[PDB]
């Protein structure tokens, strides 16, 4: 698994108030570490993980200035896009922006990205060459031509290849005891009534980190993915995660079924059954 540093920003227009709101969050891997909210009084970039608090005032001042300027540009972007699409001035719209870097095994950039969505749909994205952009429609073509004229890709390529991965490496060191710790899942299978003709087996994985995990059910060697309910992986609230996978099986046939768990905290894939 490549580590990553990622910033996720949401800009929302608020015509009834005459303004906009911009929220940004930063993550290393699955761990949030900073936030910014333009509705906050005196708004600043703020810490959200303990290990970032060792950064000095220059870091917080620079982060604040950078995210504040970005909030101002995105406030204007909401108006610009409303005009490109000839939308009413009364409606709220959403512009999301996400950029970040994944770290290769050699300490270089494995992949960088910088993209936007408007009202949930892809708008404009930096291609993996970091030299060119892909636009989703005629509006985004206007933006793309602007950004080709300005050589906006150079600003992003330089960041992604340089400071993004160097920052990431620093944060991985700062937070090594949590960020670089894999915690394996605690696992068990529960049994619940379903009907006359069925019982539910639920395979649980609790307390694991990172969030990536595989839970599958088999019956005597055959995978059951088509008939199982697999919930979205969910946060515990303490930096770990939870997941379950459930299947309705015939009454009395529980021993034919095995749950299979893969996670980077386990030494070997686990097989378990209801007991």
């Amino acid at each position: 698994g490549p580590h990553s540093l990622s910033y996720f920003s949401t800009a929302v227009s608020r015509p009834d108030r005459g303004d906009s709101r911009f929220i940004a969050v930063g993550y290393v891997d699955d761990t949030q570490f900073v936030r910014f909210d333009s509705d906050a009084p005196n708004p600043r970039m703020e810490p959200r993980a303990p290990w970032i608090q060792q950064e000095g005032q220059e870091y917080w001042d620079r982060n604040t200035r950078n995210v504040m300027g970005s909030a101002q540009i995105n406030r204007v972007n909401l108006k610009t896009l409303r005009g490109y699409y000839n939308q009413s001035e009364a409606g709220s719209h959403t512009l999301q922006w996400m950029y970040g870097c994944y770290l290769g095994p050699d300490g270089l950039l494995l992949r960088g990205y910088d993209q936007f969505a408007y009202d949930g749909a892809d708008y404009l994205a930096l291609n993996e060459d970091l030299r060119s952009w892909t636009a989703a429609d005629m509006a985004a073509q206007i933006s793309k031509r602007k950004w080709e004229a300005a050589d906006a890709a150079e600003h992003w390529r330089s960041y992604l290849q340089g400071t993004c991965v160097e920052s990431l490496r620093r944060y991985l060191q700062m937070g090594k005891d949590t960020l670089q710790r894999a915690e394996p899942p605690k696992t068990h299978v529960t049994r619940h009534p379903s009907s006359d003709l069925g019982v539910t087996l639920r395979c649980w994985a609790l307390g694991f980190h990172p969030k990536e995990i595989s839970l599958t059910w088999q019956r005597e060697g055959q995978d059951q993915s088509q008939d199982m309910e697999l919930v979205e992986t969910r946060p515990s609230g303490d930096g770990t995660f939870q997941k379950w996978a459930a299947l309705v099986v015939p009454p009395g046939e529980e021993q034919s079924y095995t749950c299979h768990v893969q996670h980077e905290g386990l030494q070997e894939p686990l097989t378990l059954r209801w007991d």
């Binding site: 930063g26 970039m45 870091y59 300027g69 970005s70």
Partner: peptide, 9 residues
């Protein structure tokens, strides 16, 4: 370390 946007859409 947050990179500022430099350009508008």
């Amino acid at each position: 370390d947050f990179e500022r946007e430099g350009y508008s859409l």
